[PDB]
Design a protein around this ligand. Structure first.
Ligand SMILES: [Mg+2]
Ligand SMILES: [Mg+2]
Lengths: 301, 49, 49, 294, 257, 48, 48, 273, 50, 89, 145, 48, 186, 40
């Protein structure tokens, strides 16, 4: 079933476009004029819709009757396949799970249980009473309000999309001499705050690495966040605990308004032979205690 | 329903840039189209060659 | 560059380069547990050029 | 930083003011990021060289990288006999004339950067004013709910300029294709054949042939046709936002509007100052009907 | 790191352990014929910074024959940090300090003929340059394990390389390994973090489910009279009236719902 | 931050957010007007 | 230290006042080099 | 192979002790013993030096660096100046609108004490010293009623308070003004009193509570450094929120934070937050 | 790395942890929420710096 | 060793005048100090303290923590008895 | 874990991995019937520093044991030496004798998947030339003892 | 001569600047720009 | 509904009071102080748990036997106390001072102060970034002119159904597409 | 030197859950009114 429906594209036929349709579509794609039909749907989107509804319309049961698969048959293939997984295989799996299932796992509700069982066409214990209960309760809202397909639809901060950060920026440069490319040069690219943009840079580096089929620098998150690293190390040594320091446990000292002046004139008057000296990753460290806190993790160093 | 209706409408229909008095439509102390003073100015003029 | 890159990619996983791929699972590594320090990233171009 | 961000906001704002197009925050910041990295490159290369300032006679010498860093100081034993105060002032003034020379260099460099930046903005800017629908009215013409009123005075003084040939479109692209047509016409001619064997010819081919760049050599390997981003004909960030969430739409259009207003206010301030400097305008409002009577 | 004449030149920075004292070296050969990196003996006193943890400047100071470069003709001194221009990770040598007589590298005027050995290559990204196809592979000392003149694809071909990267449809393409990247601030917001236990670190994120003894009467009263408010501990359960259940990683700052 | 922004998303109505995330929506009589559509939370009732 | 320059700080505002009523507010070399400190330490302050 | 900072290449003719290795002199047990002891205490001495450089306060370091900076070869004599530039200036005040006149320090001979005040600021009422009418009553202190003045003036939301002027009282004021619990303060060199300007924020005061340490003058509480150190610690988190003021043997009025810094104990005055 | 901390679930013996005797079996302690235990020598297979 | 300890006690130029030298003049033996350290030693090096560190972010999100069966989660009210179960664990 | 602790331990540890350690670990992987780890380890080894130095070497014993376990354990896409035929699989396969995979059909499906891939990625496929034919000459079928 | 834009007749201006910037709230340069600007327009520019 | 009218909230950034709160409800003297954990009377305790306090500890009326003691008093007391509590941030702003916790935010600022030396500090000579309009530009065209204006750059009939870009929206259209408009109209 | 460990501070209430913040209070999280310039 999986081979015929999902994997074989060549057997998939699409409704053929008329000549008028071909023209209107072309001229829509090449040059946009406002007020137009917002749909203009890519045959890519269409195709993927047909596939996902092929996953909708898949039902199990006796296959001497209509449907293709025994349930036992399905979980059998599933079991053979799950044992069959490599490292990056089950990595792809767990990513796929974190992206699709996991958020749904957070947004569920009793109101869905019937629908939740309609996926496998399994019959519940209480099915009539759940019919009644869920009918009465879904009565209290819009039908769009209650369907689990649409509950994830909006995401804050639409200016930077995860889809668009998949291609990492200027990867054809900082690949080739990663030392000449401190986090600053790239951080001018994003209109976000500090913690967020450094976070994003880490993700860029990792995506890039996995893309080029080489292993990523795991010391990179420690390098970009170095100040946060050392603050956490010294906090862990101070309050005795293992974890990451959170806000409640910060010192209650109140600095004066001008407290930063000394450091301000020290920074404003600094000077550097080259730009590498300006931002090297290790300028955070002076005493030996600094070097002992920064590398305590690698028993190599 | 009505309130967010109004919010969307007032936000989409708001003007921007500088007017004839050299200021924003939302500027603090100085105003434009007082008592439909421009509306009437179109009433009596009209647009024709 | 293409060869330095090729080699690094190959010693990352060999199973990417097989026509019929065998099972690819991570094993131990000879440099240490921190071996990534001596391994990672992409081949680097000479800085003069 | 400032001179750039002002111009970029000019572009973004204008882009939404004239046509209904929004620029993606992503894009807006990545322009600036490119300026920044340009400056950074110029810095990288600027530190490989040194500038020498010199004070009295030649007897106080200061060697400093153009960024203002100090590398060496040479001094006559004459200086050693002065005072600590005067020694300090002397060296400090040499350092100053060094920083001066360096800063002259850097400012040429920066002029160069500004030019590259402009050249990179040009397909966008000339993207918005080179369309058959683009227009402007004089800033002194009254605007009323129907449309814009006619400025009365000096019917000679108003000249409408036109950037577009009104007959069939000749785009910049046709001009570049014309340029390479003339390149080939010149090359393939007999006199051009003899010229391609000169030093001038091979300088031309080394700089401006990309086609002959060996595989893996830095730089573009084809000649590129000039980018075409016609503003009213290309949907950019408003269509994606309108499909996804209305709220981000309203917020981004709001940002563009605000930026445009701000730019316009700046232009009004500069105009006012230039008007005061030449004495046509007073230093406090003397004409309040120009404000209160609307 | 640059290339000339067939070999590498790298800038590096030698440093004491406390990084009090430092020396730059501009062009150093990267040569993997040296088991251990060699410096001029004179630097031993220049690099000695007697801190608190090392009352004498160095942890290790001894005499070795050191006849490899050219009976105790040299001195092993450790540990001196070394920062190479390309690499993000410091490399920690215990170098041979050689006097003038043992070996004198003055070799050209102003030029000290310093080089880097496998002491420091093992610790850098430079090490990946040591494998077949790299730029140091030519300069490895001859072995049964290292074939001198073989083409790269010949060698890797023997190790079992068949086609190019992900060329066969059976192996997934490298860049689909990571498709989605999760950043809380850019999408759906932060998690709602609760705990049952002593602290956030000592407890579980989970509340107790509906099947608890103390929750059953309450949940009952809550199913039957749905509209009025009900007393109980049944509030603390993972299950409740509202369509939004309490389970870990609820995104509560998300616009929808 | 003395006066933080708080929850700013208008994609649903206040009453729809309230409805989904709060049990308090089920008891409209027990809540004053100023708090009516304003709560996203579940409340426990303890009778002393 | 000389009580030549005095100040008054509100939450977000800063007042630097030159006090030398005897010589008619004529600043000495020390007092001026001091003022260029108080001015930029007041001006580079976080809350001003 | 170009080398920077390494001074003449290959140094100059210096072999190590172990490498050169001249034949070891046989010292009598005397010589050897003495070598061991002098070089042992040489190492001890060095360890001391390093610890002292580690523990040096920043102010000390700055004074040192800028002292060396100005250093000349000859120790030059001070230059004769104007008749004087160095009179501490009088803090500015307005004569016409006033709590009190700012009295010149040039009049320092005219001044009285807190007990027997010289006639000045006649146009203003004079605060009276607060003393017990009978035996069982507490014996009041300028600190006691300083705190209660401020507390009551904070409850009535007044801008200015006229308050008793003694050494530790205006000490307390300077400390509170440091921490920003008080908008400002001034001593007009009026004998009896001086004035404090209160600060309000968000409609109520900046001072939650202000309390004296002792009710009597006959009771004097001493604060161990460990106690003042306990205050700073809220179950493992460093808390400077609340301020405690105290006298030192050195007659300084300090908060508990500086006290803990230099590990000195002091006599308690008041708490405020 | 996290130091081992006393009075945990797998640390504390029965009578302090629960007021009852609970049998110590190396298989399936429901109270301790573990499925199974292979019981190697504590510090042997782990790295020492850990 | 602190303030409770026993006290330590205390025209021309002195012998401590000569050892001192201007940082402007090149010193005795040209010991290759690292610039960063001499910056830090005279107090002019821009500070990076723990005060400048923000939150340490979760970068790679761990795993879903699945509900671990406890003794208070049982589908029969009987299995959690008073004679058997004294608590969830 | 033991293999890491071999170079991590100051007291009992060796500076570089001894050959003894290598062939020991390999022998554990052979004796665990652990395929993936054996392959990856072998390749990692021949990519190590000790290998390039000449210190560790792949011997004939390691090599042939490696091959032994490579034969006798299940391969993900293919049937392996030491896969036992099942008489009763005829219930499904349709035949009692032969092996339940045909390398020819497997190759063909590989070609098909190659085109389906080029389509999924580029949206369009180049039609092969008319002179193009799949070369099946190099394929041999499964032999069974 | 246009040496400066600002002029005022108000007594003890300094106090009013202080107390005005006490009532102000945020540090975002939007806020700062408006607060400063409004201060300037209402007093130091001579509109009225 | 009287309880929802009186709702209070608590800033949990600090997770418990950072100073002692001494406050009395009518006749009931209450102390809310910082503790290592939650310590309180069972009822007061799960009231303080209702706020999400980890580190608070609280006591009502010295000795527990002290009058007046009612269930009412026990509740009203702890709620009154919590309602008198000041958050640390609020305290810090109250004195016009910067909290130790919020200083990290200044870091990027301070960072590019340090990094502004050299070219990054440099501005283009001659150019302010403020460019005033001088002339008036209008490129608009009569419809018949733009009918075939973009045929070479793009396809013919470029402006076809475009309502904003044409004075005659229906020109250039082939009959079918003209019919479509009316078709949706009726 | 601070012998109370932040590791163990608290009181188990049994089933009663309470919220904690990873960093700041959730209300202070999205700053969009100054970011997207919606303010008076
Ligand atoms: Mg300092
Ligand atoms: Mg009684």
């Amino acid at each position: 079933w999986y081979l015929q429906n999902i994997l074989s594209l060549e057997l998939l036929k699409l409704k053929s476009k008329t000549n008028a349709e071909k023209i209107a579509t072309y001229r829509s794609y090449m040059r946009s004029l406002a007020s137009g039909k917002d749909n203009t749907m890519s045959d890519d989107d269409v195709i993927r819709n047909i596939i996902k509804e092929r996953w909708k319309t898949l039902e199990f049961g006796d296959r001497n009757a209509g449907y293709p698969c025994t349930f036992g048959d399905y979980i059998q293939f599933l079991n053979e396949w799950f044992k069959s997984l490599d490292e990056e295989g089950m990595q792809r799996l767990r990513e796929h799970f974190d992206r699709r299932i996991r958020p749904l796992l957070a947004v569920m509700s009793p109101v869905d249980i019937l629908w939740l069982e309609a996926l496998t066409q399994n019959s519940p214990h209480n099915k009539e009473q759940l019919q009644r209960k869920i009918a009465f309760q879904t009565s209290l809202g819009t039908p769009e309000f209650f369907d689990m397909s649409k509950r994830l639809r909006y995401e804050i901060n639409e200016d930077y999309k995860v889809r668009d950060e998949l291609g990492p920026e200027l990867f054809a440069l900082w690949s080739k001499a990663p030392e000449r490319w401190p986090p600053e040069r790239l951080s001018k690219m994003y209109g976000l705050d500090f913690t967020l943009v450094r976070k994003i840079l880490v993700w860029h580096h990792f995506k890039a690495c996995y893309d080029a089929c080489v292993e990523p620098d795991w010391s990179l998150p420690k390098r970009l966040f170095a100040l946060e690293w050392i603050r956490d190390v010294r906090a862990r040594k101070h309050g005795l605990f293992y974890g990451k320091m959170r806000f409640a446990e910060q010192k209650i000292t109140f600095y004066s308004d001008r407290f930063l002046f000394r450091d301000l004139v020290n920074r404003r008057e600094a000077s550097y032979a080259n730009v590498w000296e300006m931002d090297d990753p290790y300028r955070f460290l002076q005493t030996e205690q600094d070097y002992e806190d920064y590398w305590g993790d690698n028993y190599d160093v | 329903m009505g309130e967010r209706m109004r919010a969307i409408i007032e936000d989409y229909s708001k003007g921007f840039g500088l007017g004839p008095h050299g200021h924003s439509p939302t500027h603090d102390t100085i105003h434009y189209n007082t008592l439909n003073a421009e509306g009437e100015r179109v009433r009596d003029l009209g647009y024709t060659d | 560059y293409k060869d330095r890159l090729l080699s690094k990619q190959f010693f990352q996983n060999p199973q990417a380069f097989e026509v019929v791929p065998d099972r690819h699972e991570r094993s131990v590594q000879f440099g240490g547990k921190w071996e990534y320090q001596r391994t990672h990233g992409l081949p680097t171009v000479d800085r003069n050029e | 930083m400032e001179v750039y961000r002002r111009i970029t906001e000019r572009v973004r704002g204008a882009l939404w003011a004239h046509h209904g197009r929004l620029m993606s925050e992503r894009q807006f910041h990545r322009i600036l990021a490119f300026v920044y990295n340009n400056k950074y490159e110029y810095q990288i290369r600027f530190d490989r060289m040194e500038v020498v300032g010199r004070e009295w006679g030649g007897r106080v010498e200061v060697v400093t990288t153009p960024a203002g860093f100090l590398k060496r100081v040479r001094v006559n034993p004459c200086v050693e006999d002065l005072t600590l105060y005067q020694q300090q002032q002397l060296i400090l003034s040499a350092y100053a004339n060094a920083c001066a020379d360096g800063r002259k260099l850097m400012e040429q460099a920066e002029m160069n950067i500004y030019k590259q930046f402009l050249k990179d903005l040009k397909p966008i800017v000339m993207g918005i004013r080179d369309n058959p629908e683009f227009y402007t009215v004089s800033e002194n013409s009254i605007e009323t709910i129907g449309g814009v009123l006619q400025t009365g005075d000096s019917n000679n003084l108003c000249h409408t300029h036109r950037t577009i040939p009104a007959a069939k479109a000749r785009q910049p692209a046709d001009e570049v294709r014309a340029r390479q047509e003339w390149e080939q016409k010149w090359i393939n001619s007999p006199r051009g054949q003899s010229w391609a064997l000169t030093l001038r010819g091979k300088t031309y081919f080394a700089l401006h042939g990309p086609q002959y760049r060996p595989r893996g050599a830095p730089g573009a390997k084809k000649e590129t046709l000039p980018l075409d981003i016609p503003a009213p004909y290309t949907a950019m960030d408003e269509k994606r936002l309108l499909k996804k969430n209305w709220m981000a739409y309203l917020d981004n259009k709001h940002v563009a509007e605000v930026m445009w207003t701000r730019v316009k206010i700046a232009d009004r301030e500069k105009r006012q100052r230039l008007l005061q400097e030449t004495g046509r305008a007073w230093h406090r409002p003397i004409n309040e009907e120009a404000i209160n009577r609307w | 790191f640059r290339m000339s004449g067939g070999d590498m030149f790298v800038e590096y920075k030698v440093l004491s352990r406390d990084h009090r004292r430092s020396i730059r070296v501009e062009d150093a050969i990267v040569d993997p014929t040296f088991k251990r990196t060699v410096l001029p003996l004179g630097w031993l006193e220049l690099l000695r910074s007697p801190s608190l943890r090392l009352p004498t400047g160095y942890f290790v100071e001894e005499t070795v024959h050191v006849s490899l470069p050219n009976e105790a003709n040299a001195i092993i001194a450790g540990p001196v940090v070394l920062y190479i221009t390309g690499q993000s990770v410091p490399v920690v040598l215990n170098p041979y300090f050689v006097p003038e007589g043992t070996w004198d590298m003055r070799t050209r005027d102003g030029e000290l003929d310093l080089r880097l050995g496998m002491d420091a290559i093992e610790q850098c990204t430079l090490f990946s340059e040591l494998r077949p196809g790299g730029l140091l592979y030519g300069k490895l000392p001859e072995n049964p394990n290292v074939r001198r003149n073989e083409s790269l694809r010949a060698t890797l071909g023997r190790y079992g390389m068949k086609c190019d990267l992900a060329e066969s449809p059976l192996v997934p393409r490298p860049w689909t390994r990571m498709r989605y990247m999760f950043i809380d601030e850019l999408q759906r917001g932060p998690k709602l973090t609760e705990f049952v236990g002593h602290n956030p670190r000592n407890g579980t994120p989970w509340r107790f489910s509906q099947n608890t003894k103390y929750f059953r009467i309450g949940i009952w009263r809550d199913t039957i009279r749905r509209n009025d408010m009900n007393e109980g501990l049944h509030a603390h359960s993972s299950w409740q009236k509202s369509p939004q259940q309490s389970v870990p990683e609820v995104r509560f700052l998300a616009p929808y719902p | 931050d003395l006066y933080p922004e708080g929850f700013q998303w208008k994609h649903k109505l206040n009453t729809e957010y309230n409805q989904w995330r709060s049990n308090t929506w089920l008891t409209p009589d027990l809540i004053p007007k100023e708090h009516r559509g304003r709560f996203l939370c579940n409340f426990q009732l303890n009778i002393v | 230290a000389n009580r030549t320059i005095t100040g008054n700080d509100g939450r977000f505002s800063k007042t630097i006042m030159i006090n030398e009523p005897q010589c008619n507010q004529a600043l000495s070399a020390k007092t001026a080099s001091e003022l260029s400190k108080e001015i930029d330490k007041a001006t580079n302050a976080v809350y001003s | 192979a170009k080398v920077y900072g390494a001074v003449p290449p290959l140094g100059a003719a210096q072999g190590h002790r172990l490498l050169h290795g001249k034949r070891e002199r046989e010292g009598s047990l005397f010589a050897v013993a003495n070598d061991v002891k002098r070089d042992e205490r040489l190492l001890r001495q060095q360890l001391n030096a390093l610890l002292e450089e580690e523990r040096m306060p920043m102010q000390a370091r700055l004074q040192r660096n800028e002292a060396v900076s100005s250093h000349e070869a000859v120790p030059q004599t001070p230059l004769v100046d104007l008749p004087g530039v160095e009179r501490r200036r009088d803090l500015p005040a307005d004569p016409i609108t006033r709590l009190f006149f700012q009295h010149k320090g040039d009049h320092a001979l005219y001044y009285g004490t807190y007990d027997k005040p010289s006639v000045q600021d006649d146009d203003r009422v004079q605060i009276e010293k607060r003393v017990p009418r009978r035996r069982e009553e507490n014996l009041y202190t300028p600190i006691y009623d300083f705190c209660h003045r401020i507390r009551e003036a904070t409850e009535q939301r007044k801008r200015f308070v006229v308050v008793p002027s003694t050494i530790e009282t205006r000490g307390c004021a300077r400390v509170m003004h440091d921490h920003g619990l008080v908008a400002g303060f001034r001593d007009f060199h009026n004998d009896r009193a001086f004035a404090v300007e209160l600060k309000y924020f968000q409609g109520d005061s900046t001072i939650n509570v202000i309390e004296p340490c002792s009710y009597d003058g006959r009771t004097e509480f001493e604060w161990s450094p460990k106690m003042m150190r306990r205050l700073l610690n809220t179950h493992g988190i460093h808390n400077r929120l609340v301020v405690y003021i105290c006298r030192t043997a050195d007659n300084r009025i300090i908060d508990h934070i500086h006290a803990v810094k230099e590990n000195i104990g002091g006599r308690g005055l008041m708490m405020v937050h | 790395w996290a130091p081992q901390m006393e009075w945990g679930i797998e640390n504390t013996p029965s009578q302090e942890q629960y007021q009852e005797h609970v049998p110590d079996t190396t298989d399936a302690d429901f109270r301790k929420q573990r499925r199974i235990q292979s019981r190697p020598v504590k510090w042997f297979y782990e790295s020492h710096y850990t | 060793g602190g303030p409770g300890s026993p006290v330590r006690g205390p025209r021309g130029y002195t012998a401590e005048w000569r050892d001192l030298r201007n940082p402007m003049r090149p010193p005795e033996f040209p010991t290759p100090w690292e610039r960063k350290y001499r910056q830090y030693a005279r107090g002019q090096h821009p500070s990076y303290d723990m005060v400048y560190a923000g939150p340490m972010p979760e970068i790679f999100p761990m795993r879903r923590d699945f509900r671990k069966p406890t003794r208070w989660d049982f589908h029969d009210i009987e299995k959690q008895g008073k004679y058997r179960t004294s608590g969830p664990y | 874990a033991l293999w890491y602790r071999a170079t991590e331990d100051p007291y009992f540890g060796t500076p570089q991995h001894t050959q003894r350690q290598a062939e020991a670990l390999l022998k554990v992987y052979v004796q665990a019937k652990q395929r993936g780890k054996a392959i990856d380890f072998m390749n990692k080894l021949r990519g190590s520093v000790e290998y390039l130095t000449g210190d560790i070497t792949i011997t004939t014993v390691m090599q042939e044991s490696y091959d032994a376990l490579l034969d006798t354990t299940p391969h993900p896409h293919l049937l392996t030496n030491g896969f036992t035929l099942e008489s009763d699989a005829a219930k499904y396969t349709g035949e009692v004798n032969k092996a339940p995979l045909s390398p020819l059909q497997f190759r063909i499906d590989m070609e098909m998947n190659k085109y389906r891939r080029q389509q999924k990625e580029e949206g369009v496929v180049r039609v092969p030339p008319a002179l193009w034919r799949l070369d099946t000459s190099a394929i041999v079928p499964y032999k069974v003892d | 001569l246009g040496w400066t834009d600002l002029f005022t007749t108000i007594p003890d201006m300094t106090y009013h600047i202080k107390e005005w910037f006490d009532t102000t709230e945020h540090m975002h340069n939007d806020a700062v720009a408006w607060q400063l600007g409004h201060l300037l327009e209402t007093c130091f520019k001579m509109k009225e | 509904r009287e309880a929802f009218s009186n709702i209070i909230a608590v800033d949990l950034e600090q997770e418990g009071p950072m100073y002692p709160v001494r406050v009395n409800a009518d006749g009931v003297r209450v102390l809310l102080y910082p503790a290592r954990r939650i310590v309180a009377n069972f009822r007061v305790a799960d009231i303080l748990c209702a706020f999400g306090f980890q580190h608070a500890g609280c006591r009502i009326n010295l000795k527990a036997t002290n009058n007046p003691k009612s269930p009412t008093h026990t509740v009203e007391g702890v709620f009154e106390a919590v309602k008198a509590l000041r958050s640390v941030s609020e305290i810090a702003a109250s004195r016009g001072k910067v909290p130790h916790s919020l200083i990290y935010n200044i870091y990027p600022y301070l960072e590019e102060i340090r990094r502004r030396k050299g070219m990054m500090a440099m501005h283009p000579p001659g150019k302010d970034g403020l460019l005033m309009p001088d002339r008036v530009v209008d490129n608009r065209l009569p419809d018949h002119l733009k009918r075939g204006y973009y045929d070479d750059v793009y396809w013919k009939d470029f402006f076809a159904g475009s309502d904003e870009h044409l004075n005659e929206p229906r020109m250039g259209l082939r009959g079918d597409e003209m019919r479509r408009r009316l078709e949706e109209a009726q | 030197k601070n012998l109370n460990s932040w590791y163990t501070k608290g009181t188990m209430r049994g089933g009663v859950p309470r919220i904690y913040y990873a960093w700041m209070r959730p209300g202070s999280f999205t700053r969009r009114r100054f970011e997207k310039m919606r303010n008076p």
